Amino acid sequence: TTIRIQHKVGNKLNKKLAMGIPMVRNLWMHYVDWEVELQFDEYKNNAMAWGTSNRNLNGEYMNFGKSGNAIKTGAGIFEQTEVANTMYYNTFSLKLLEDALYELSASKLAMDDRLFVIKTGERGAIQFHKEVLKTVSGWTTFVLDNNSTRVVEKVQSRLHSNALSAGFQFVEYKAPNGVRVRLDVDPFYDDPVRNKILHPMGGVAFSYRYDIWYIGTMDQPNIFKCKIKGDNEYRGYQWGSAVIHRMATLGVCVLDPTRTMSLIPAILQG
Amino acid sequence: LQFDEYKNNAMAWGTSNRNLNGEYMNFGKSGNAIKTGAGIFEQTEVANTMYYNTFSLKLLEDALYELSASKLAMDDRLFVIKTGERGAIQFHKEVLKTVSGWTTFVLDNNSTRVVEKVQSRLHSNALSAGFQFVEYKAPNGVRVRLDVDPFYDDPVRNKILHPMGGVAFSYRYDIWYIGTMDQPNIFKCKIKGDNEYRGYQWGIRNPFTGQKGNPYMSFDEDSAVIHRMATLGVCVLDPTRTMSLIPAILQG
Amino acid sequence: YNTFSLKLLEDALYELSASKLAMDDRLFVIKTGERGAIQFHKEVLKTVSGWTTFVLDNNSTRVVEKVQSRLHSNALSAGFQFVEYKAPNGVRVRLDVDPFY
Amino acid sequence: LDTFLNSFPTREFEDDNEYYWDVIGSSRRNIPLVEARDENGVVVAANAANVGVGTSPFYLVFPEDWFADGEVIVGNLNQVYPFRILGDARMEGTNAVYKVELMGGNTQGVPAERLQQGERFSIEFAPVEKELSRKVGDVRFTSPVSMRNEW
Amino acid sequence: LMGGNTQGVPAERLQQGERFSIEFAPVEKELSRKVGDVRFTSPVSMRNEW
Amino acid sequence: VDVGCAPDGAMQLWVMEYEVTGIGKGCAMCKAINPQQAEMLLKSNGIYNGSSYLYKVTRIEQVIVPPCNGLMAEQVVTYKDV
Amino acid sequence: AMQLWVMEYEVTGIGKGCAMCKAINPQQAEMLLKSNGIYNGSSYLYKVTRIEQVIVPPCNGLMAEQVVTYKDV
Amino acid sequence: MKTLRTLKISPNAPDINSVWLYKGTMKYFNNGEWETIG
Amino acid sequence: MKTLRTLKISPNAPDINSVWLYKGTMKYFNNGEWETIG
Amino acid sequence: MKTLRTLKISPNAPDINSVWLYKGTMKYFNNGEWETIG
Amino acid sequence: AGKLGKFQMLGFQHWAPQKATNLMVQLLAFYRGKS
Amino acid sequence: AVDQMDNIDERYGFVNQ
Amino acid sequence: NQNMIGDEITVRDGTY
Ligand SMILES: [Mg+2]
Ligand SMILES: [Mg+2]
């Protein structure tokens, strides 16, 4: 796919300006070469991860540009990995999660090779914490004590000789037959600009999206960024009017999309 | 001593006497306006206003997590609470209510050590008792810790008492530093080269400087008057880097 | 006082110590008699018995000890006493019984 | 009280007038929708049919000229309905209306529910051809406001 | 009443037993005249016999 | 903005959370000159002003009027909080 | 950008709520709640029951109050 | 099935893994509701 | 003298050292049979 | 607010911090006396 | 379970003394863009 | 300079003059 | 007119 930017410009702002006013109680000079490089690096970031294809099954592209030639676009990260293993839930459960991850691992993975690193947002981590805690609270066979778990430990404080601390968080869940589910947080799920539907428990409803990249070992990368050898990024200045033009071609390839599982909230669908 | 107390009470406890119309209404003895600026404790309450009667730990953690959600790093979420001694007991009981709702877990004495063994002549197995919850660790990196300051429990300036014992200012929680800013957030303002004024107005002899005899007299009376003067202010750059939690019987 | 309670003495010794003493200075050695120690023991038993938010196992307290006897292989003893109490913000209480009392 | 005020540093000033400091926010913003019209200019109500049924043009009215000549913007559902802007903004007073077609291979149109007032829209990127390309897109900036104190 | 106060102080804040303490003495910048003052204290003694 | 209200001349808007003991929890929106006066308007003009000792107010926070349109403040009391 | 509107509503099945908007008419104050509120993806759940304008000269008064009780759940 | 190890005396509702005791009525949390025993 | 520690919610009877709670009837093991409290 | 972690079947009043189960009654310590449920 | 507005982002078209600090201040009552 | 929580810095885009 | 310099603050209580 091919990306292009322009700006009619020197160091000073132009017509697309926006001010930020805070709510408190009693209510420079723009470097234009750092904004055309940052907001064109982000055009390539949005084309790589959040891009969509416009072809038929007849091979025909559907959108034509200013020159009458068709705008050729290729799918991104998040569309190519959403052609297999993708689930849209209305309520999060470990009953849905441990059954989705076991049947894929029983049919594709050896028992030692069953580590599943959930990449999610920050509020997806507190929702996974409360769903393991609800599951652990139904394990009435075992009496959970502070001796092993240490949810209440002893901290050193000036105020008391025996001074305590409190708090914990479930970050891992281990399922039968070797299915281990870990959890780490990517910060880009919590984007207030791109993610605009809100979740009633806090956040932007995209942090509640769970993405298992890297199912298994492949002996090669499954997902990578395509590039042309040499220098495929272009730059031009059109002095009259003084317009800075930038152009860049790029691509993303997912070889096996069946090795990527996604749990998206169903409020982000349709 | 009294001039330094004037300097500390102005810097900490100052209120801006500028009106809503941008005018000053307090006029001095000459007739010009007395212009004052906000203190430490007025500049710091404009953003994270909070008042209460019943302390809730859930509301404290869900107000330190909604401004530090994806803005502060996971290792940058230690929030030290400066408060009084009676704010530490109100914090202790509220964490104690939180860990008594955790009925999934059993808080055994073998790890919390609330009842300890001590040596005594009274018994062969003599026991001790006592504990205090001084820290709560919220999920996703947020840690909350107390720092009891004797500045809060001062019974001279703080006259409104609390019904649960002590002054009401002891029950006030202020998290002055949230994260790292790349610069000092709270500092004290001074003018460069501005030495604080000191002058004497004396007649035939000066008791202050021990001087007998005056070439240039102020008046004919046998006296000496000392005048001291200082221009001073404070600054809080980011008041959203600071959270307050005040008892509402202080009436804002 | 007419009847002794820990709610009385802990508040009598915390309003005193918050007003007059520092944090590390709130050690109170109470001089009393033999009957005042049992009266002390029953109140800090009654206060700790209300702490049902903690399970007080025998592994830490050792109120029931394993002794050696001719009668049984797993023979036991039973007994304890509470001689101290640690109130919040640094207040400790230690008993010092005196035969003159 | 003096032990508390000694933990704060001291910045020295030149004059005794009021002093300022400039506070800033981000340059990346989403813009609400005002209304959406189809190709004949009549507004898309909530009880209406789909709008872009044949890669057909329609209009998106925004309260500010924030979007540019050839960018793909998305609604509240990102990447489900990509909207490629056709041409510059026609300014209906302060409002800016863009002629808009659907981009992501969409052959059934966007629902009428997805084109209502209040839905925020966000810039993704600006795609062009491989052959004979022309200029698209634009760059957005941000401005600081000031706070104040005195002596 | 300083602080920018326009609508006054309530009447129940000005009753017998209300305690007042000294904050500071702010002056104008131009042609200010002398304000504020300075305070002193003194101790006591106790006694015993045989 | 100088309408003649008590706190230095301006109108002040507040949000209150509380928990009625034995009954439940609730939200409130209230204009009041002090945050002390906002909690006295719950005990005087509330739904449970008769048994006004039940109100355990846990937050009183000020709402600042924005320069233009938008949702200022919101407070949902869900059934699973209660 | 003209007036202030305090709304009492009821998220259907989830609970009761309180809100405050700034809008020219109460038809836009409901628009700024359903589109910018927390129930943004399920905005059909908002059932607004009372809207009243914030007029000043009382300067001290309740505007909304709504308790979720133990027998409503 | 579901074992409860605590009984809580409170006018407010406790956590759902506890027994609600208030003045003479006993309750417990079953099927998403506080269910009166009596 | 018999210390019951756990309460169990089950549609059929649990062990004799536990309290039986079902739908609003508290039953416990006294005098060899399940005795309903009410 | 007050956790009663044990229940004791006895014809005598066990303790403040336990529940007193006698034949068809469930008494507990409230307001300085034993309050029977049901 | 409710928000409060701490900022509002407006376009400019809908609108020296001493400086305390020279470098600008990013408030925590402002979202910031994510890479 | 992008922050550890992926947040970009807006103060790099300015020139003091 | 014993003006403490600073920037400009003018003291006025008699000759000094
Ligand atoms: Mg896939
Ligand atoms: Mg602040």
Q: Identify all chain G residues contacting D120, using CB atoms and an 8 Å cutoff.
A: 35
For residue C75, the CA-to-ligand 2 centroid distance in Å is: 64
Residue length of chain J: 38
H-run or E-run covering F16: strand F13-20
Coil/strand/helix, residue F56: strand
Q: Identify all chain A residues contacting K10, using CB atoms and an 8 Å cutoff.
A: 18-21
On whether the CB atoms of residues B102 and C55 are closer than 8 A, the answer is no
Q: How many CB pairs under 8 A join H and I?
A: 38
Which of L4, L6, L14 is nearest residue A31 as measured by Cβ atoms? L14
CA distance A19 to chain F (A): 12
Nearest to B114 by CA among C26, C48, C13: C48
Q: CA-to-CA distance for A103 and E33, rounded, in angstroms?
A: 87
Nearest to D132 by CA among A247, A9, A233, A73: A247
Instruction: Read off the amino acid at residue A241.
Output: S
Touching chains G and L? (3+ Cβ pairs < 8 A) = no
The 3-state secondary structure of chain L reads CCCCCCECCCCCCEECC
Written as one string, the DSSP assignment of D45-105 is -TT---S-TTS--EEEEESS----SS-EEE-SSTTTSEEEEEEEEEEETTEEEEEEEE-SS
Q: Identify all chain M residues contacting B194, using CB atoms and an 8 Å cutoff.
A: 5-7
On whether the CB atoms of residues A29 and A12 are closer than 8 A, the answer is yes
Q: CA-to-CA distance for F26 and F46, rounded, in angstroms?
A: 11
How is residue A12 written in tokens? 């000073």
Tell the residue number behind the tokens 């709670």, with chain if given. Answer: I21
Method: cryo-EM
Question: Chains touching chain H at 3 or more Cβ pairs under 8 angstroms?
Answer: A, B, F, G, I, J
* F5, F9, F11, F17: CA torsion to nearest 10: -90
On whether the CB atoms of residues A91 and A130 are closer than 8 A, the answer is no
Coil/strand/helix, residue D116: coil
For residue A260, the CA-to-ligand 1 centroid distance in Å is: 4
How far CA J30 is from CA of D17, H9, H35, J17, J21, in Å, comes to 66, 8, 21, 10, 15
Coil/strand/helix, residue B104: coil
Instruction: Read off the amino acid at residue A117.
Output: V
8 Å CB contact of H5 and I10: no
Q: Does K21 touch chain D (CB under 8 A)?
A: yes
Between strands J25-30 and A152-155, the pairing is: unpaired
Q: CA-to-CA distance for K4 and B126, rounded, in angstroms?
A: 54
How far CA A265 is from CA of A184, A268, D102, in Å, comes to 18, 6, 24
Q: CA-to-CA distance for A248 and A231, rounded, in angstroms?
A: 9
Q: Identify all chain I residues contacting H38, using CB atoms and an 8 Å cutoff.
A: 24, 38
On whether the CB atoms of residues G2 and G24 are closer than 8 A, the answer is yes
On whether the CB atoms of residues B144 and B62 are closer than 8 A, the answer is no
H-run or E-run covering F25: strand F24-31
Q: Measured over all CA atoms, what is the biggest interatomic distance in chain K, rounded to whole angstroms? A: 44
Angle between helices B57-64 and B85-99 (to 10 degrees): 100
Q: CA-to-CA distance for B112 and A154, rounded, in angstroms?
A: 7
Nearest to K11 by CA among D138, D31, D94, A18: A18
Q: CA-to-CA distance for C85 and B122, rounded, in angstroms?
A: 15
User: Which bound ligand lies closest to the C-alpha atom of A82?
Assistant: 1
Q: CA-to-CA distance for H34 and H26, rounded, in angstroms?
A: 10
Residue length of chain M: 16
Nearest to F71 by CA among A109, K7, G10: K7
**Rg of chain D over all Cα atoms, to the nearest angstrom:** 23
8 Å CB contact of B101 and H14: yes
On whether the CB atoms of residues B112 and A152 are closer than 8 A, the answer is yes
Q: How many CB pairs under 8 A join A and L?
A: 27
Nearest to B172 by CA among B186, B157, B187, B183: B157
User: Which bound ligand lies closest to the C-alpha atom of A85?
Assistant: 1
The 3-state secondary structure of chain A reads CEEEEEEECCCCCCCCCEEEEECCCCCCEECHHHHHHHHHHHHHHHHHHCCCCCECCCCCECCECCCCCECCCCCCHHHHCCCCCEEEECCCCHHHHHHHHHHHHHHHCCCCCCEEEEEECHHHHHHHHHHHHHHHCCCCCCCEECCCCCCEEEECCCCCCCEEEECCCCCCEEEHHHEEEEEEECHHHCCCCCCCCCCCCCCCCCCCCEEECCCCCCCCCCEEEECCCCCCEEEEEEECCEEEEEEEECEEEECCHHHCEEEEEHHHCC
Coil/strand/helix, residue B97: helix
Nearest to D20 by CA among D151, D150, D144, D148: D148
Q: CA-to-CA distance for A194 and B70, rounded, in angstroms?
A: 15
8 Å CB contact of F75 and K2: yes
Q: How many CB atoms lie within 10 A of CB A242?
A: 11
Q: How many CB atoms lie within 10 A of CB K34?
A: 24
Q: Identify all chain F residues contacting H11, using CB atoms and an 8 Å cutoff.
A: 21-22
How is residue K3 written in tokens? 């928000």
Angle between helices A94-108 and A122-136 (to 10 degrees): 90
Q: CA-to-CA distance for H21 and J37, rounded, in angstroms?
A: 9
8 Å CB contact of B237 and K6: no
How far CA G37 is from CA of D35, D36, F64, G4, G30, in Å, comes to 19, 22, 18, 16, 10
Nearest to D39 by CA among D62, D60, D57, D61: D57
Neighbour-count burial for A185-218, b at 16+ CB within 10 Å, e otherwise: bbbbbbbbbbbbbbbbebbbbbbbbbbbbebeee
Touching chains D and L? (3+ Cβ pairs < 8 A) = yes
Nearest to C85 by CA among B135, A158, B126, B111: B126
Instruction: Read off the amino acid at residue I32.
Output: G
Q: How many helices (H) and strands (E) does chain I have?
A: 0, 5
- Distance in angstroms between the alpha carbons of the first and the last residue of chain H: 21
- Distance in angstroms between the alpha carbons of the first and the last residue of chain E: 59
- E strands, chain G, in order: 3-11, 15-23, 46-53, 61-69
On whether the CB atoms of residues D19 and D13 are closer than 8 A, the answer is yes
CA atoms within 13 A on the CB side of D60: 37
Question: Chains touching chain F at 3 or more Cβ pairs under 8 angstroms?
Answer: A, B, E, G, H, K
